Design an enzyme around this catalytic site. Sequence first.
Site, mmCIF file in Angstrom:
data_model
loop_
_atom_site.group_PDB
_atom_site.id
_atom_site.type_symbol
_atom_site.label_atom_id
_atom_site.label_comp_id
_atom_site.label_asym_id
_atom_site.label_seq_id
_atom_site.Cartn_x
_atom_site.Cartn_y
_atom_site.Cartn_z
ATOM 1 N N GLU A 35 3.584 67.124 39.467
ATOM 2 C CA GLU A 35 3.762 67.848 38.214
ATOM 3 C C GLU A 35 3.086 67.120 37.066
ATOM 4 O O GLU A 35 2.377 67.744 36.272
ATOM 5 C CB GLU A 35 5.241 68.015 37.854
ATOM 6 C CG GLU A 35 5.982 69.117 38.593
ATOM 7 C CD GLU A 35 5.432 70.530 38.325
ATOM 8 O OE1 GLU A 35 4.634 70.709 37.384
ATOM 9 O OE2 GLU A 35 5.801 71.473 39.069
ATOM 10 N N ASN A 46 0.628 77.103 28.792
ATOM 11 C CA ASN A 46 0.534 78.251 29.670
ATOM 12 C C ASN A 46 0.007 79.502 28.967
ATOM 13 O O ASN A 46 0.011 79.577 27.735
ATOM 14 C CB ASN A 46 1.906 78.495 30.308
ATOM 15 C CG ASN A 46 2.431 77.257 31.036
ATOM 16 O OD1 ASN A 46 1.758 76.699 31.888
ATOM 17 N ND2 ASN A 46 3.623 76.836 30.700
ATOM 18 N N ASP A 48 1.275 82.469 28.746
ATOM 19 C CA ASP A 48 2.282 83.161 27.959
ATOM 20 C C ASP A 48 2.574 82.457 26.631
ATOM 21 O O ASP A 48 3.468 82.877 25.902
ATOM 22 C CB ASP A 48 3.577 83.377 28.765
ATOM 23 C CG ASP A 48 4.297 82.088 29.125
ATOM 24 O OD1 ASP A 48 3.843 80.988 28.786
ATOM 25 O OD2 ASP A 48 5.349 82.174 29.770
ATOM 26 N N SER A 50 3.821 79.457 26.239
ATOM 27 C CA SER A 50 4.803 78.389 26.398
ATOM 28 C C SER A 50 4.047 77.106 26.828
ATOM 29 O O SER A 50 2.856 77.156 27.137
ATOM 30 C CB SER A 50 5.860 78.775 27.433
ATOM 31 O OG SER A 50 5.276 78.903 28.719
ATOM 32 N N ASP A 52 4.547 73.201 29.100
ATOM 33 C CA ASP A 52 5.339 72.386 30.015
ATOM 34 C C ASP A 52 5.291 70.947 29.489
ATOM 35 O O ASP A 52 4.234 70.470 29.066
ATOM 36 C CB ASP A 52 4.791 72.468 31.429
ATOM 37 C CG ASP A 52 4.740 73.880 31.946
ATOM 38 O OD1 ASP A 52 5.657 74.663 31.683
ATOM 39 O OD2 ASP A 52 3.771 74.213 32.632
ATOM 40 N N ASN A 59 9.455 73.747 31.113
ATOM 41 C CA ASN A 59 8.924 74.826 30.274
ATOM 42 C C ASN A 59 9.682 75.160 28.986
ATOM 43 O O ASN A 59 10.908 75.293 28.983
ATOM 44 C CB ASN A 59 8.762 76.090 31.111
ATOM 45 C CG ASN A 59 7.950 77.153 30.402
ATOM 46 O OD1 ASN A 59 8.485 78.157 29.954
ATOM 47 N ND2 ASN A 59 6.659 76.916 30.265
#
Length: 129
Positions: A35, A46, A48, A50, A52, A59
């Site tokens: 990750e 991301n 959308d 958002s 991470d 998120n």
Amino acid sequence: KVFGRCELAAAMKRHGLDNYRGYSLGNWVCAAKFESNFNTQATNRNTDGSTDYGILQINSRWWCNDGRTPASRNLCNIPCSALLSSDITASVNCAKKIVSDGNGMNAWVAWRNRCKGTDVQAWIRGCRL
């Protein structure tokens, strides 16, 4: 902070992640590896809108507040920057809520695609725990 493999395993173990909800420590270390590559300061945005954050790439749409995500929920009730600390406590506490959410560790795409069904035990091999 960029954690060493065994160093992270021990901190996670200390924070109660070994076997939390049935996931052995190797799963958590493998997840962190893929990750964030063990980097607490990792961020990835991301489509959308958002983002991470941290060692476990949590998120902003659901778990933390970064003040710039459409329809955010802040379920862990912490600003997302708290997740980039060298102290992994916040990331661990929030991850515990996420893994209990119902989908288990499948919530982490890297875990699902690169750890799930593999010998995760290899990730803690050689460590003094």
